[PDB]
C-alpha cells in the first residue's frame, strides 16, 4: 500500500486544467492566462513527532504508548509548477514542496526503525522482543483493521 | 496612443511651416496634409527606441513646475547638462514630460 497504491492513483492525472476569464472590452485581452500543475513521485520519510516548541523528534513506539500519541509518519510529495499562461513566457518549470499531511503506519514494516534489530537492540529501548506488530496506534489505543 | 506634443516643437513646427506654404500655392489638397502629419508622428515614435541608445545626465535646481492632464511640465533654472563631450551651461530650461 505504501509503495504502489499511493502512487498508482497519482500515476493517472491529479492535475486539472484551469483557464482564466476572458473579460472583454478592457484593452488588449489577446489570451487569458492558463495555469497547470504537475506531480512526480511521492515521498515518505521516517515517522517524527513535533513537540510544543516546533522541534522534530524521533517518534518512539514505546514512548507513544505512555503519552497516548498516534503513530504516524509525515507524508511528502513532489510538486512541480508546469504552467503555460499562454503568453510570452512559454515553457517554464518551477519546483515546489508543500506538506500534505501524515499517514498511519503499521508496526513491523519496512519504514520503521524497530524492524531489523536483533534481540539485543530491542531490549535496550524497553521493548518486548516476542511481541510482533500488525496493528495501528491511534491516540495510544491499539487499533487493528480486521479483514 | 499617439503623442501630438512633438508636433509643436523644433522638429514639428519646422515641418508644418513648409506644408502650409504648399497649400496657398494651389498644389496639394488640404486633406493630404492630415495624412502626412499623422505619418510623421508614427515614424518618429518608433525611431526613439531603435536608433537611440545614447543618454545624457542633467544637474540643476528646481524653480517652477506645473502638472495637469498627466503632463509633468517642469521649468528649471541654472541646469548643467553633464555629458562626456558637449558641455553647455544654460540659465533656464523647460522640461515637459508625459505618460
Amino acid at each position: 500500500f505504501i509503495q504502489m497504491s499511493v502512487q498508482r492513483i497519482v500515476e493517472d492525472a491529479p492535475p486539472i486544467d484551469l483557464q482564466a476569464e476572458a473579460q472583454h472590452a478592457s484593452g488588449e485581452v489577446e489570451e487569458p492566462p492558463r495555469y497547470l500543475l504537475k506531480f512526480e513521485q511521492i515521498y515518505l520519510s521516517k515517522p517524527t513527532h513535533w513537540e510544543r516548541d516546533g522541534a522534530p523528534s524521533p517518534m518512539m513506539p514505546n514512548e507513544a504508548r505512555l503519552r497516548n500519541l498516534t503513530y504516524s509518519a509525515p507524508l511528502y510529495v513532489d510538486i512541480t509548477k508546469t504552467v503555460i499562461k499562454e503568453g510570452e513566457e512559454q515553457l517554464q518549470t518551477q519546483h515546489q514542496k508543500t506538506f500534505i499531511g501524515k499517514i498511519p503506519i503499521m508496526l513491523r514494516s519496512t519504514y520503521c526503525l524497530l524492524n531489523g534489530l536483533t534481540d539485543r537492540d530491542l531490549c535496550e529501548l524497553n521493548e518486548c522482543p516476542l511481541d510482533p506488530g500488525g496493528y495501528f496506534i491511534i491516540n495510544g489505543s491499539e487499533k487493528v483493521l480486521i479483514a | 496612443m499617439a503623442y501630438q506634443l512633438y508636433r509643436n516643437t523644433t522638429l514639428g513646427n519646422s515641418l508644418q511651416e513648409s506644408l502650409d506654404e504648399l497649400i496657398q500655392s494651389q498644389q496639394i489638397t488640404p486633406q493630404l496634409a492630415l495624412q502626412v502629419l499623422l505619418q510623421f508622428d508614427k515614424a518618429i515614435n518608433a525611431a526613439l527606441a531603435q536608433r537611440v541608445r545614447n543618454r545624457v545626465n542633467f544637474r540643476g535646481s528646481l524653480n517652477t513646475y506645473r502638472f495637469c492632464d498627466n503632463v509633468w511640465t517642469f521649468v528649471l533654472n541654472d541646469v548643467e547638462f553633464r555629458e562626456v563631450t558637449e558641455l553647455i551651461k544654460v540659465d533656464k530650461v523647460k522640461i515637459v514630460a508625459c505618460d
Partner: protein, 113 residues
Amino acid sequence: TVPKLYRSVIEDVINDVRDIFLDDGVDEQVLMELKTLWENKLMGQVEEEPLNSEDDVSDEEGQELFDTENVVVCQYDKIHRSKNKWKFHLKDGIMNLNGRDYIFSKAIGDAEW
C-alpha cells in the same frame, strides 16, 4: 555621429510618404521642393475677511514666457521626492540648446528646490 543620425531619420520619412502623394495625384517634383525649403529653416490681520495685508508673497509670472529658456519634451519614469531633495528619471526626449538640436535615450539626475 550626432549629425549623421539626423540624416537617416530624414531619409526614412521622405522615402516613406512617397506613396501617399501618388494616391492623391501629386507629382514627384513637389517632394523635392519640400525637403529643400525645410532644410534651409533648420540652419497684521485682525478681521477674518480681508487678505490684502499679506500681499507681495509670490514672484512675477513674466519670468517664464519671454523666449529665454529651452523647450525640451520627454517622458517621465519615476518621480521621487523627500523634503528638499527632488529625484527625476527621464527617458526618450528631444533637446534644443540654442538652436542646436540634441537627442538622448535616458536621463537620470538630481535637483533641489
